[PDB]
Enzyme design. Structure first.
Site, PDB file in Angstrom:
ATOM      1  N   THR A  52     -27.746  46.012   5.530  1.00  0.00           N
ATOM      2  CA  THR A  52     -28.558  45.217   6.440  1.00  0.00           C
ATOM      3  C   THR A  52     -29.074  44.002   5.676  1.00  0.00           C
ATOM      4  O   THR A  52     -30.264  43.682   5.718  1.00  0.00           O
ATOM      5  CB  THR A  52     -29.805  45.979   6.995  1.00  0.00           C
ATOM      6  OG1 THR A  52     -30.605  46.427   5.905  1.00  0.00           O
ATOM      7  CG2 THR A  52     -29.412  47.143   7.854  1.00  0.00           C
ATOM      8  N   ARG A  55     -41.446  29.954   3.016  1.00  0.00           N
ATOM      9  CA  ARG A  55     -42.133  31.128   3.500  1.00  0.00           C
ATOM     10  C   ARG A  55     -43.558  30.695   3.842  1.00  0.00           C
ATOM     11  O   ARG A  55     -44.237  30.024   3.044  1.00  0.00           O
ATOM     12  CB  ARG A  55     -42.113  32.228   2.420  1.00  0.00           C
ATOM     13  CG  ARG A  55     -40.708  32.809   2.162  1.00  0.00           C
ATOM     14  CD  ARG A  55     -40.211  33.614   3.377  1.00  0.00           C
ATOM     15  NE  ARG A  55     -38.863  34.189   3.232  1.00  0.00           N
ATOM     16  CZ  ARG A  55     -38.603  35.456   2.887  1.00  0.00           C
ATOM     17  NH1 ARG A  55     -39.597  36.306   2.637  1.00  0.00           N
ATOM     18  NH2 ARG A  55     -37.348  35.893   2.841  1.00  0.00           N
ATOM     19  N   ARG A 110     -38.945  48.321   7.068  1.00  0.00           N
ATOM     20  CA  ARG A 110     -39.039  47.493   8.253  1.00  0.00           C
ATOM     21  C   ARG A 110     -37.756  47.514   9.083  1.00  0.00           C
ATOM     22  O   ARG A 110     -37.784  47.885  10.254  1.00  0.00           O
ATOM     23  CB  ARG A 110     -39.380  46.045   7.853  1.00  0.00           C
ATOM     24  CG  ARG A 110     -40.721  45.887   7.174  1.00  0.00           C
ATOM     25  CD  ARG A 110     -41.810  46.506   8.030  1.00  0.00           C
ATOM     26  NE  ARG A 110     -41.902  45.874   9.335  1.00  0.00           N
ATOM     27  CZ  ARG A 110     -42.603  46.366  10.350  1.00  0.00           C
ATOM     28  NH1 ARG A 110     -43.260  47.503  10.176  1.00  0.00           N
ATOM     29  NH2 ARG A 110     -42.654  45.726  11.522  1.00  0.00           N
ATOM     30  N   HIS A 140     -39.925  30.494   7.471  1.00  0.00           N
ATOM     31  CA  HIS A 140     -39.851  31.938   7.552  1.00  0.00           C
ATOM     32  C   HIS A 140     -41.151  32.714   7.316  1.00  0.00           C
ATOM     33  O   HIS A 140     -41.932  32.359   6.443  1.00  0.00           O
ATOM     34  CB  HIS A 140     -38.793  32.350   6.509  1.00  0.00           C
ATOM     35  CG  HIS A 140     -38.104  33.651   6.787  1.00  0.00           C
ATOM     36  ND1 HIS A 140     -38.685  34.876   6.537  1.00  0.00           N
ATOM     37  CD2 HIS A 140     -36.873  33.915   7.295  1.00  0.00           C
ATOM     38  CE1 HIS A 140     -37.846  35.836   6.882  1.00  0.00           C
ATOM     39  NE2 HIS A 140     -36.738  35.282   7.344  1.00  0.00           N
ATOM     40  N   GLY A 191     -29.409  31.736   0.794  1.00  0.00           N
ATOM     41  CA  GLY A 191     -27.959  31.663   0.785  1.00  0.00           C
ATOM     42  C   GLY A 191     -27.435  31.568   2.196  1.00  0.00           C
ATOM     43  O   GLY A 191     -26.241  31.487   2.433  1.00  0.00           O
ATOM     44  N   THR A 251     -42.145  38.456   3.736  1.00  0.00           N
ATOM     45  CA  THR A 251     -41.565  39.798   3.777  1.00  0.00           C
ATOM     46  C   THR A 251     -42.035  40.594   2.573  1.00  0.00           C
ATOM     47  O   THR A 251     -42.675  40.047   1.660  1.00  0.00           O
ATOM     48  CB  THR A 251     -40.025  39.762   3.716  1.00  0.00           C
ATOM     49  OG1 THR A 251     -39.607  39.421   2.384  1.00  0.00           O
ATOM     50  CG2 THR A 251     -39.472  38.735   4.719  1.00  0.00           C
ATOM     51  N   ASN A 305     -37.065  37.729  12.980  1.00  0.00           N
ATOM     52  CA  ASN A 305     -36.288  38.173  11.850  1.00  0.00           C
ATOM     53  C   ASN A 305     -36.169  39.671  11.667  1.00  0.00           C
ATOM     54  O   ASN A 305     -35.252  40.131  11.004  1.00  0.00           O
ATOM     55  CB  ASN A 305     -36.778  37.490  10.551  1.00  0.00           C
ATOM     56  CG  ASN A 305     -38.294  37.589  10.351  1.00  0.00           C
ATOM     57  OD1 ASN A 305     -39.066  36.872  10.977  1.00  0.00           O
ATOM     58  ND2 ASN A 305     -38.706  38.468   9.468  1.00  0.00           N
ATOM     59  N   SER A 364     -27.735  37.883   6.587  1.00  0.00           N
ATOM     60  CA  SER A 364     -29.191  37.821   6.645  1.00  0.00           C
ATOM     61  C   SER A 364     -29.671  37.416   8.030  1.00  0.00           C
ATOM     62  O   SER A 364     -28.882  36.995   8.872  1.00  0.00           O
ATOM     63  CB  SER A 364     -29.735  36.836   5.592  1.00  0.00           C
ATOM     64  OG  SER A 364     -29.468  35.482   5.917  1.00  0.00           O
ATOM     65  N   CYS A 365     -30.970  37.548   8.265  1.00  0.00           N
ATOM     66  CA  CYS A 365     -31.554  37.165   9.541  1.00  0.00           C
ATOM     67  C   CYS A 365     -31.338  35.677   9.769  1.00  0.00           C
ATOM     68  O   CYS A 365     -30.927  35.250  10.857  1.00  0.00           O
ATOM     69  CB  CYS A 365     -33.059  37.490   9.558  1.00  0.00           C
ATOM     70  SG  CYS A 365     -33.862  37.428   7.957  1.00  0.00           S
ATOM     71  N   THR A 366     -31.575  34.883   8.734  1.00  0.00           N
ATOM     72  CA  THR A 366     -31.411  33.440   8.854  1.00  0.00           C
ATOM     73  C   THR A 366     -29.955  33.117   9.197  1.00  0.00           C
ATOM     74  O   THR A 366     -29.689  32.314  10.097  1.00  0.00           O
ATOM     75  CB  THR A 366     -31.845  32.694   7.549  1.00  0.00           C
ATOM     76  OG1 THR A 366     -33.194  33.066   7.169  1.00  0.00           O
ATOM     77  CG2 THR A 366     -31.791  31.205   7.762  1.00  0.00           C
TER      78      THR A 366
END
Ligand SMILES: NC(=O)c1ccc[n+]([C@@H]2O[C@H](COP(=O)([O-])OP(=O)(O)OC[C@H]3O[C@@H](n4cnc5c(N)ncnc54)[C@H](OP(=O)(O)O)[C@@H]3O)[C@@H](O)[C@H]2O)c1
Ligand SMILES: NC(=O)c1ccc[n+]([C@@H]2O[C@H](COP(=O)([O-])OP(=O)(O)OC[C@H]3O[C@@H](n4cnc5c(N)ncnc54)[C@H](OP(=O)(O)O)[C@@H]3O)[C@@H](O)[C@H]2O)c1
Ligand SMILES: NC(=O)c1ccc[n+]([C@@H]2O[C@H](COP(=O)([O-])OP(=O)(O)OC[C@H]3O[C@@H](n4cnc5c(N)ncnc54)[C@H](OP(=O)(O)O)[C@@H]3O)[C@@H](O)[C@H]2O)c1
Ligand SMILES: NC(=O)c1ccc[n+]([C@@H]2O[C@H](COP(=O)([O-])OP(=O)(O)OC[C@H]3O[C@@H](n4cnc5c(N)ncnc54)[C@H](OP(=O)(O)O)[C@@H]3O)[C@@H](O)[C@H]2O)c1
Lengths: 338, 338, 338, 338
Positions: free
Chosen positions: B122, B236, B12, B182, B214, B185, B318, B154-156
């Site tokens: 990433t 999630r 992704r 979220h 985290g 994934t 995200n 991370s995205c978050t």
């Protein structure tokens, strides 16, 4: 009397099979071991809490290398190599192969080398060597010595075959075609990720995804008279469980909707009692969660075009219904070991 | 100038990064190789057809061991061992580590041993050793020789950090808590299957699943003044992409809703231009698919309880938003190799 | 002893309430009539087959203007005007208002004019005039003559209040904020269609959708000491049932995670027995389908920042759990008519 | 030249039609008014933000009683009674009936009584009296004065018909059957709620729901030679848009897979250019979002059993593809008013 059974691969079918087993009246099975990929803790937890079956109402506990359910204790092991399994020492008669990875005669036989006497693949066998049975269709043709590696075929074939048997017996199938609108499974991807099948590679919950099925050709394994007469495809859709079969057959004996329904219902009450459920209520997919029958004919959807072209739609709980049949087939094996 | 980049793990983020790159105005990057698990064919096919991004409008073609996009050809290789990679011989400067499996300094550094000079994870780095940067927060602290293994977090954390910076700078954050709702994934399971985390083991599209994160502790990596001051969890939910952050902080300078919004907007037009998007329309999640910003403040949802307890909600794609930032970070590294 | 009850609006709550009622040990209720929008046939069918609760295991039958369940017969009527209902003639003491359309004192009172003595809104009351009760929080403050129109508040308020009571009693709530990640409901749209709320207008199953909630302010109705101290928002997500509350409160008495859990668990076994369930298993949303408690504290998620800022996450089956409470509140009314 | 058009019912099809129009190269239509149920504000907001189509990239603005798109202003009105509409005074030539409630000749004709000259139902016409056309099938049979109330048929019929024409012309269809695996629509319920159809009453996003369809019988309206020869059902599944048709026909001229594909493709490049798209890539449903063609043949799924029993699968964006056809039909009418 009783054969010792071990489950290899404690996944969807694996856990479904166990629960079905524990809900049975009587049994000639004694599940004594479970081979899984994780630990005993994870096995007890996923056995109790199921997103689809809901919470297993039973006394479930576990320790470092075993799980206990309603008093019955089952050893937990975790070897990715069947050849390393203690089947001989644990005196395992029958292993339920539900890992999805030992579906060939040789593959599944690694459990025989390791000591088991017979293995039952909860899926189509690949290549030559395995005997295939579909309760209610060719089970009277079951002989203990025919194969050490047997198969219960797929969920779609179990739904399809019974109906094909009834349809062929009463009108004669010339040729036919079928499509199964099937819930997604762990073989598909939650999001676009590589897969041997460029279509199963795509996000399951947001796509209708076409994929091949061998189920139609497979009915020939259990109804040889239909060799080369059927075929079809599958469409995976965004539901977590229960599927439906859409079968269209050119028949030899002209007939009418009321009649194909009449015989299908006749069979659900007699020759296919327990195998075919006849539903004439305007129901939807989630209404069949937990249904024991292999095929649920939806009568109000039956259709006959110009007398000899019939369409019947049958539902099935591809996880639970199927597991009920693999239980039945193990029980059948039990009623005739050596 | 131009640094030679290779993508490890064409998933992704891997494919999102590539599309983001190709859509970029100018670049100092030259993507010359992709290491994936499947074949060149599957890579070109998942690069073109995306269930979330849609068709990639570009000239895409491929052969046995490369793929070509708009004339730029990229070699395809497939080694699960980074230690086998021809990085030295292909003169690779930077490797984008998007496999999700080499997230420790040592792990990622296998690329360095194979010849790459710097590797960009990433994802958050696990353990000691990796340098972490969040564009718009601590990018001015980027020095080429600080770390050979860097992380874009991370995205978050990328959505949380820019908003924390603005809120901290203007009101002083004493302590706070956050929850991210979220999208699921590929680290989650489509149906109930084992997982290190018993919650991530449960069917993603039919559950709201709590999991640890985290992300809150991690903003300290990029805003040190916030060490030990933030914390949180993740939930999630059944959507395939875009997520939202719910940040509650106890502030030092009493303030009012209109004001936190006023400063968040101010930042979106100035200091956080391109990092923070200020949205005051009553929109929903899918309206943010393809948004480049790392944080999308939903102003009408901003809330201030008794002057010093603020809540801000910020959306984020995200996959795409994050990938734009890893392109930014790869470009930042490029504008200062050695 | 026994009061006569009629259900107005046989929807989600309406049918859920009925089933809960039929599963009860003993009761002082006698459901004698149901007012619905369709026919008796549709009422019996949707009562039996539920996509979320599954098939109602009971003897269900129906005729032109009534339905019978396990012998108990209930008249079916269908008047969109409560004023036209035969409450007086059928001697209806209590009407369960679950149509979602008569939530004001006057509105719900149309059932009083029509002959009923007391009406219970299965939702927040709008405007002045209705008494609000939350079992386990302010039920000892229930007096028969206070209001002819009462309310059981919302599902979110029922989850929130119990936990707020326990948290306030043991540490003192200064101010707090809350977000509920809630399953979509029939008030939302399956696909983009007009709605008074431009956000609830959007396709529910493919969006995370923000929407206002009055639940936080509402706890003041049942815990007056918390007036103006709480607030929050809601996020509707793609699940058909069960929701979760995320409450963050600044507390007066410094404490630690182990302790807030300790008191919450203490309360689940004593003062909130039956109202608060203490869950310390790593479970997910669908694991709470059918749970009777109003609040299910997820202990491993409890969090305390710097001693006085606490976060507790509590699950709830917004349909079934809530209906169990509206049953309890009707039963409470019964134990004190006139 | 140019005919004055008004849109009645600004829903999915209504807004899809408008966007389709604005994207069109040239037109003979002038959209001058929209009758909706809500306000101008909600119309502009749902026109811009679409959960399936995404943001409408155009200059959209609005005021108390009109909306402006790219400079073209359109009056907004809101009457649930078409009989109250100022059609006569606004010189309306054609009304697009997309409310889904005026589908009979009489019903739709209320527009005519109010001043419009011709009305186009964006759905099948119920009862006698409406003329039906499917672009690419029977459009050459369009005559301005045949009917004042015309119909563009259903989405399913528009996908089925072009494929039936090609198959019938080349092999002669004796009889056949079809099943459409269809995304859910606003005629379905998000959660279990009453409905004329007990199946459409069941929660759409968590069920595979069987429902009847007039699509197969309806192709006779546009290919008369097929009267009484086709038939079928529908299966609504949890996706918000794009559907697929599974057509099985008994043909008169024995043929082979390669050949039916050969002719279907031939047609997609010639006689059905723009109506039938020939897709031989292994794609999935969301890959067809925004496709203009009415039918998208999935070649790799084409199947021929014993030479005269063929199965073809064809995808279609039920909202966008269909809306492109109603624009085509409105334009066809335009190129021949009186
Ligand atoms: N799902 C259905 O409806 C259905 C219907 C009919 C037939 N089947 C068939 O049943 C089989 C199992 O499928 P499933 O749906 O139950 O999937 P599943 O949940 O993945 O179950 C397979 C289980 O076996 C484990 N496993 C894999 N390799 C193993 C190995 N070498 N040794 C021990 N355990 C191993 C898996 O572990 P990890 O997952 O941790 O790697 C998992 O627990 C397949 O052949 C499938 O085609 C499924
Ligand atoms: N999803 C998001 O929004 C998001 C946002 C920020 C960060 N991330 C992070 O990005 C990373 C990638 O996640 P993802 O969501 O993109 O998942 P993903 O699609 O599974 O991507 C991982 C990619 O790496 C490949 N891979 C696995 N093992 C490999 C190996 N030994 N060598 C080479 N390639 C290998 C995978 O192939 P196979 O799948 O065929 O094995 C796949 O193409 C993770 O660290 C994740 O935490 C994700
Ligand atoms: N869903 C939840 O989780 C939840 C939780 C707490 C509180 N509530 C509250 O409970 C109430 C009912 O909501 P619900 O979710 O159960 O929705 P619902 O399923 O729509 O139920 C309302 C029922 O009342 C019927 N109805 C509407 N107007 C009527 C009238 N004038 N006369 C007779 N019947 C009428 C509806 O008929 P038609 O649908 O055929 O028009 C439907 O059967 C609302 O006030 C809601 O806020 C719901
Ligand atoms: N969905 C598809 O793919 C598809 C494909 C082909 C044909 N169709 C057909 O297209 C038609 C519209 O369906 P849809 O999917 O677009 O549903 P929809 O979004 O509900 O569209 C109907 C529109 O009409 C409005 N409306 C309802 N009653 C009205 C009245 N008395 N006067 C004026 N406007 C009124 C609705 O407003 P409110 O919703 O606010 O009441 C809504 O804006 C139906 O006949 C359907 O069968 C749909």
């Amino acid at each position: 009397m009783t054969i010792r059974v071990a489950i290899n691969g404690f996944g969807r079918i694996g856990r479904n099979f166990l629960r079905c087993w524990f809900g049975r009246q009587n049994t000639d099975l004694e599940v004594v071991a479970i081979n899984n990929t994780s630990d005993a803790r994870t096995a007890a937890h996923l056995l109790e809490y199921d997103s689809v079956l809901g919470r297993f109402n039973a006394d479930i506990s576990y320790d470092e290398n075993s799980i206990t359910v309603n008093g019955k204790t089952m050893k937990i092991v975790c070897d990715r190599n069947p050849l390393n399994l203690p089947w001989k020492e644990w005196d395992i008669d029958l292993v339920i192969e539900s890992t999805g990875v030992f579906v060939t005669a040789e593959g599944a036989s690694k459990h025989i080398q390791a000591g088991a006497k017979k293995v039952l693949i909860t899926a189509p066998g690949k290549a030559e060597g395995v005997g295939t049975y579909v309760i209610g269709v060719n089970d009277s043709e079951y002989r203990h010595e025919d194969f050490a590696v047997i198969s219960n075929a797929s969920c779609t074939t179990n739904c399809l075959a019974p109906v094909a048997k009834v349809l062929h017996d009463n009108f004669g199938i010339i040729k036919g075609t079928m499509t199964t609108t099937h819930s997604y499974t762990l073989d598909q991807r939650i999001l676009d990720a590589s897969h041997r099948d460029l279509r199963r590679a795509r996000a399951a919950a947001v796509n209708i995804v076409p994929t091949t099925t061998g189920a139609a050709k497979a009915v020939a394994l259990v109804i040889p008279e239909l060799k080369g007469k059927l075929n079809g495809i599958a469409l995976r859709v965004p539901t977590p469980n229960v599927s439906v079969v859409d079968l269209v057959v050119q028949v030899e004996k002209p007939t009418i909707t009321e009649q194909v329904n009449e015989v299908l219902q006749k069979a659900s009450q007699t020759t296919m009692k327990g195998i075919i459920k006849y539903s004439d209520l305007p129901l939807v997919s989630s209404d069949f969660r937990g249904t024991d029958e292999s095929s649920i004919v939806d009568s109000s959807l039956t259709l006959v075009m110009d007398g000899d072209l019939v369409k019947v739609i049958a539902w099935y709980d591809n996880e639970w219904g199927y597991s009920q049949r693999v239980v039945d087939l193990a029980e059948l094996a039990a009623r005739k070991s050596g």
